[PDB]
RNA sequence: UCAUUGCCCAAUCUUUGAACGCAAACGGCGCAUGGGAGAAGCUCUCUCGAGCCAUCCCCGUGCAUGCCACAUUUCUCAGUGUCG
RNA sequence: CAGACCUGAGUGUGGCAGGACCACCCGCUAAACUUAAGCAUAUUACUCAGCGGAGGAAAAGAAAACAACCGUGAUUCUCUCAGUCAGCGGCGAGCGAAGAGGGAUUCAACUCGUUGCCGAAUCGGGUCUUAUAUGACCUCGAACUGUGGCACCAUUUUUGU
């Protein structure tokens, strides 16, 4: 709807920052089993719902 | 001798005998933090194209500030912190998570100048 | 270790003919040897009550049991304080420590 | 106008008031009766005047004295050097029981206002049993006062001095 | 000891005299709120003999509990079931009223420990028990080395574990061996015992 | 990534840590003078289990009665020994 | 004096939370108290200036509820209970 | 003649409680499925579920026991008896124990209320001393009775008063 509380405001924010490629610089290190940014949220698939 | 008189058929209590308690040595807190403060208030400036434009036109700085901040507080802080006065502040927090303060610095000051007092580019 | 208790013949038909060193003691006996029960407890010899004590024999036997322990008494004194109280005995005599003890030695089953 | 005969109350008021009334209402046994024939305005009072002679007092008098006995007596190779015992009323529930039982207070003064009356109910009867003098006496409070307590529970004289007899 | 009188006197329940006493009490409660603190018992004799001994920490309560029995609550009183535990006023109620009472006191506050409690009265409606409850926080009490046992960890309640003698009554404790039996290791424990399994070390 | 700043902030931690340490203990001292109360707030007075905070203080627990005491005097039980 | 080493006593510990000033799909909103900061004002006329201080804002901490003891040696009351 | 006492308020003052956790415990409460080749009694099960509520374990615990002895002597627990000649039971299904013995573990045992307890409650709270008691003093909880003593085993029953 038009309006949507601060908490709510928080939930997207927190998520968005996670919804993108894992920090690559990390990836490079020694012994990095590291498949990918697993848990990334999306929208034309994955509405956050509610 | 002498009974009360009565204002309703039924009884009451009277509010009285209240006068100091002042429970607890209280106020606990040691060495008071005093909550928030300035190197923390203003987190890193915002500097987009829009900043670049805003700087010019209303004399305005866009800064990333502590999003909890109420406007006031910010106002107090900067003026003192930057030796200035600001004609006005529009703020918002984007879910970016940061409060952005659009501040017109007063004519007594120039946001670009002032920028490169900070040494802002 | 083991705390002196009486000897008894003990229950039943099936047990009519048998003796076991039973619970407790017999204050009466203990009396008969002479000994304050409270004190006896301090010595570490059991006491009882619910031994109602059905017959003579028991004393007889028991006093000897009692006695026997006592014969085999050491009793430690306290120094400075006089050995005296019961006439507690000989410091080196044991060796009180270690072989805990089983009371059966002082008075057998 | 004023509301009290047309008021309402909290129940606690209600209770006590109602309690008196209900207490008048039922037929009470003679056994329940035996409070009611209390001593007269004079008499009860007069006695209090005496009673105050036989009242009990501050912790101090015995202590102050103890301090005496100790100092003198217990040290010095003299024995029993103290003064005399005070002369106050014999009191106290339990005490009086024995007293009665030992048939030894002369006169017992029974309160008819006491928290379980049941606590004392057997007493006139008892007195009667011990064929001793017993009075149906008013109020705990005054009694309290001769002993300086908020109220006071049972009372008897073993003694006094003959002068007062 | 005056109680000796008191007690006997106290046995005279069934009489008019008492019934006066009773009656006043029967208006008094009947007038009165549900659970109340007392500045002293109304039955000291039991209280003192169930242990009351005059100082702080000892707290008195009078408590009102509906008497009667109870229904098995069921919505709309319908049981599907096989016949057996049936009836609206069926299962009769194993726990005792006193015990519930105490227990309800136990529930009633966030402190009190039932030291014990005795019935004082009952009417057509309510049972009254006068409950000797203790707080275990008074510094004198805590100081009190006689009672301080009361303080301890097992005493994070008591009454609902079934610790009054009465509670213990419904809890069944009798030492009469062949009338002591089963409950002696609780109800349950013994069940666990008695229906054990084949733990045979060897075979 | 003129990375050195982290440390500097971490230095900030250090003054700050200290500082309260001092203040805190400042406080503590000036609380006493009575065996109890308000000397010193709870936050000056250090948590220690529900139970641990509960507990029978030793005086009241070891300071049992004359009856026993006399008795204790009367029935001590230290060492005996037996064998023969 | 390494160690995002190790250990750990030493401390920090948001926002919550039984969760409690009140409240609540609101970072809402209060209430007592302390503390802070400051256009204006004021004052110092210090020339500036400075200070001082107000409207204004913020922070700290009380402040939920029950139960429990207590109060100066008494806290204030109430009541057809009750004293003469 | 005159003002209490008594109780119930309201403060203040100091605690407490909640909710956790909840393997095991401790209470409480409390199914049906099943089987009986049906099935209602029965069984399951005095189990499930539910609920209350503790601990480090809890629980139990010191005779209104057991016995029928040539006797036994808190509790617990274990082994045992005995799946029994105890026995319950459409008496069927199905069920069903105790005592003792052996044994582990234990020198485990304990209070008050009814006994003269009593030369200003011997108390407690507070206070203050003493470096704590103690000292001390109030408070005022407390003589509606806290102390001490004594506690049907004793005290010597009794009588040596």
CA atoms of C39 and C30, how far apart (whole Å) = 11
C1’ H17 / CA E156, Å = 11
What's the rounded Cα separation, in Å, for the pair D105 and D154? Answer: 12
CB C106 within 8 A of CB C72: yes
Count of alpha carbons within 13 angstroms of residue A43, beta-carbon side: 5
Q: CB–CB of B9 and D13 under 8 A?
A: no
Contact C46, C4 (CB under 8 A): yes
Omega prior to A40 cis, within 30 of 0:
no
Q: Which residues of E28-58 are buried (b: 16+ CB within 10 A; e: fewer)?
A: bbeebeebeebeebbbbbbbbebebeeeebb
- Does an H or E element contain E133, and which? strand E126-134
Residues D164/D139, Cβ–Cβ less than 8 Å: no
CB atoms within 10 A of CB D116: 16
Nearest to B46 by CA among B108, B107, B92, B106: B92
E200 C-beta neighbours (distance < 10 Å), count: 6
Give dist(CA C93, CA E110) in Å, integer. 60
Q: Are E131 and E99 in contact (CB under 8 A)?
A: no
Please tell me the total number of residues recorded for chain F in this structure.
Answer: 84
Q: Where are the beta strands (DSSP E) in B1-121?
A: 42-46, 60-65, 86-94, 98-105
Q: Is D104 within 8 Å of D113 (Cβ atoms)?
A: no
Return all residues near D115 (Cβ < 8 A) that are at least 6 apart. E40
Which residue of chain F comes nearest to C75, CA vs CA? F80
Q: What is the 3-state secondary structure (H, E, C) of D17-35?
A: HHHHHHHHHCCCCHHHHCC
CB B84 within 8 A of CB B54: no
CA distances from E145 to E51, E60, E116, F58 (A): 16, 21, 19, 10
- Count other C-beta atoms under 10 Å from residue E201's C-beta: 4
Provide, as residue numbers in chain E, all residues whose Cβ is less than 8 Å from the Cβ of D94. 1-2
What was the elucidation method?
A: cryo-EM
F60, F62, F64: residue with CB nearest E142: F60
Q: How many whole angstroms separate alpha carbon F27 and alpha carbon F41?
A: 10
**Length of chain A in terms of residues written:** 50
**Chains touching chain D at 3 or more Cβ pairs under 8 angstroms?**
B, E
Cα distance from N-terminal residue to C-terminal residue, chain F: 87
Q: At what angle do helices E16-31 and D11-25 cross, to 10 degrees?
A: 160
Nucleotide nearest residue F21, measured CA to C1': G11
Q: Does the C-beta of F20 come within 7 A of strand G?
A: yes
Residue of E162, E163, E139 whose CA lies nearest to E151: E139
At B4 the three-state DSSP class reads: coil
**Residue F47: what are its φ and ψ, rounded to 5°?**
-35, 145
Q: Which residues contact F82 (CB under 8 A, 6 or more apart)?
A: C69, C72, C73, C74, C101, C103, C106
The beta strands (E) that lie in chain D are given as: 90-91, 107-111, 134-137, 155-157
> Cα(C65)–Cα(C53) distance, rounded to whole angstroms?
16
Distance E184 CA to H75 C1' (A): 10
Resolution in angstrom units: 5.6
As to burial, measured by CB atoms within 10 angstroms (0-12 exposed, 13-18 middle, 19+ buried), residue B114 is: middle
Contact in structure between E61 and E130 (CB atoms under 8 Å): yes
Give the closest residue to E129 by CA, choosing from E56, E67, E173, E51. E67
Q: Which nucleotide is nearest to E137 (CA to C1')?
A: H15
Contact F57 E144 (CB under 8 A): no
Q: Which residue of F has its CA nearest to B25?
A: F38
Give whole-number Cα distances, E128 to D126, E58, E201, F3, F24, in Å: 30, 19, 55, 77, 54
Which residues of chain C come before a gap where C and the next N are over 2.5 Å apart? none
Using DSSP bridges, classify how beta strands D155-157 and B60-65 pair: parallel, antiparallel or unpaired.
unpaired
Per DSSP, the residues of E150-194 read GGSGGGS--TTTT-SHHHHHHTT----GGGTGGGTTTTHHHHHHH
CA–CA separation, C61 vs C54, rounded Å?
14
From edge to edge, which strands make up the β-sheet containing E126-134? Answer: E35-38, E58-66, E126-134, E113-122
């Amino acid at each position: 709807g038009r309006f949507k509380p601060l908490a709510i405001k928080k939930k997207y924010a927190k998520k968005l920052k996670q919804n993108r490629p894992v920090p690559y610089w990390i990836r490079l290190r020694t012994g990095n089993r590291i498949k990918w940014n697993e848990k990334r949220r999306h929208w034309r698939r994955t509405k956050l719902h509610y | 001798t002498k009974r009360k008189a009565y204002t309703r058929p039924q009884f009451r209590r009277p509010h009285t005998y209240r006068r100091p308690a002042t429970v607890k040595p209280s106020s606990n807190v040691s060495a008071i933090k005093n909550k928030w403060d300035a190197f923390r208030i203003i987190r890193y400036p915002l500097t987009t194209d829009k900043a670049m434009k805003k700087i010019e036109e209303n004399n305005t700085l866009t800064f990333i500030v502590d999003s909890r901040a109420n406007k006031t507080e910010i106002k107090k802080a900067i003026r003192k912190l930057y030796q200035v006065k600001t004609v006005k502040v529009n703020t918002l927090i984007r879910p970016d998570g940061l409060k952005k303060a659009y501040i017109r610095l007063s004519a007594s000051y120039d946001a670009l100048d002032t920028a490169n007092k900070m040494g802002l580019v | 270790l083991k705390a002196l208790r009486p000897q008894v013949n003990c229950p039943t038909v099936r047990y009519n003919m048998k003796r076991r060193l039973g619970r407790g003691f017999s204050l009466e006996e203990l009396k008969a040897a002479g000994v304050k029960p409270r004190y006896a407890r301090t010595i570490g010899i059991r006491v009882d009550r619910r031994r109602k004590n059905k017959s003579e024999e028991g004393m007889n036997i028991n006093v000897q049991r009692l006695k026997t322990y006592m014969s085999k008494l050491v009793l430690f004194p306290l120094n400075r304080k006089k050995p005296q109280k019961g006439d507690a005995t000989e410091e080196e005599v044991k060796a009180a420590t270690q072989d805990r003890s089983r009371y059966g030695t002082a008075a057998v089953g | 106008r004023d509301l009290s005969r047309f008021m309402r109350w909290p129940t606690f008021v209600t209770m006590q008031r109602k309690k008196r009334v209900l207490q008048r209402r039922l037929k009470v046994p003679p056994a329940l009766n035996q409070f009611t024939k209390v001593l007269d305005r004079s008499s009860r009072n007069e006695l209090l005047k005496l009673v105050k002679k036989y009242a009990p007092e501050t912790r101090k008098a015995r202590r102050d004295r103890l301090t005496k006995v100790a100092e003198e007596k217990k040290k010095n190779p003299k024995g029993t050097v103290s003064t005399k015992a005070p002369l106050c009323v014999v009191s106290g529930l339990q005490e009086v029981t024995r007293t009665i039982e030992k048939k030894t207070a002369r006169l017992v003064l029974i309160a008819n206002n006491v928290d379980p009356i049941e606590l004392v109910l057997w007493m006139p009867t008892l007195c009667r049993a011990n064929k001793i003098p017993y009075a149906i006496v008013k109020d705990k409070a005054r009694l309290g006062d001769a002993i300086g307590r908020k109220t006071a529970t049972c009372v008897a004289f073993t003694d006094v001095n003959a002068e007062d007899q | 000891g005056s109680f000796m009188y008191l007690n006997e006197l106290w046995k005279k329940k069934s009489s008019d005299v008492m019934r006066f006493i009773q009656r006043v009490r029967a208006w008094e409660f009947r007038h009165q709120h549900t659970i109340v603190r007392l500045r002293r018992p109304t039955r000291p004799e039991k209280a003192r003999m169930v242990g009351y001994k005059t100082k702080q920490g000892y707290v008195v309560f009078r408590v009102r509990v509906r008497r009667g029995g109870r229904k098995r609550p069921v919505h709309k009183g319908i049981t599907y079931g096989k016949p057996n535990t049936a009836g609206v006023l069926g299962r009769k109620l194993n726990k005792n009223n006193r015990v519930v009472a105490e227990q309800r006191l136990g529930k009633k506050y966030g402190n009190l420990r039932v030291l014990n409690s005795y019935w004082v009265n009952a009417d057509s409606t309510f049972l009254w028990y006068e409950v000797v409850a203790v707080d275990p926080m008074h510094r004198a009490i805590r100081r009190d080395p006689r009672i301080n046992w009361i303080v301890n960890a097992v005493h994070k309640h008591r009454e609902q574990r079934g610790l009054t003698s009465a509670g213990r009554k419904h809890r069944g404790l009798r030492q009469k061996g062949h009338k002591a039996s089963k409950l002696r290791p609780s109800r349950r424990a013994a069940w666990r015992r008695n229906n054990r399994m084949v733990f045979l070390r060897k075979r | 990534r003129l990375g050195r700043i982290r440390t500097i902030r971490k230095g900030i931690a250090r003054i700050m840590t200290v500082l309260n340490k001092n203040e805190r203990e400042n406080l503590r001292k000036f609380y006493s003078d009575k065996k109890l109360r308000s000397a010193k707030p709870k936050t000056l007075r250090a948590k220690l289990t529900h139970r641990r905070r509960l507990a029978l203080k030793a005086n009241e627990k070891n300071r049992k009665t004359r009856r026993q005491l006399r008795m204790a005097h009367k029935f001590p039980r230290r060492i005996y020994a037996v064998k023969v």
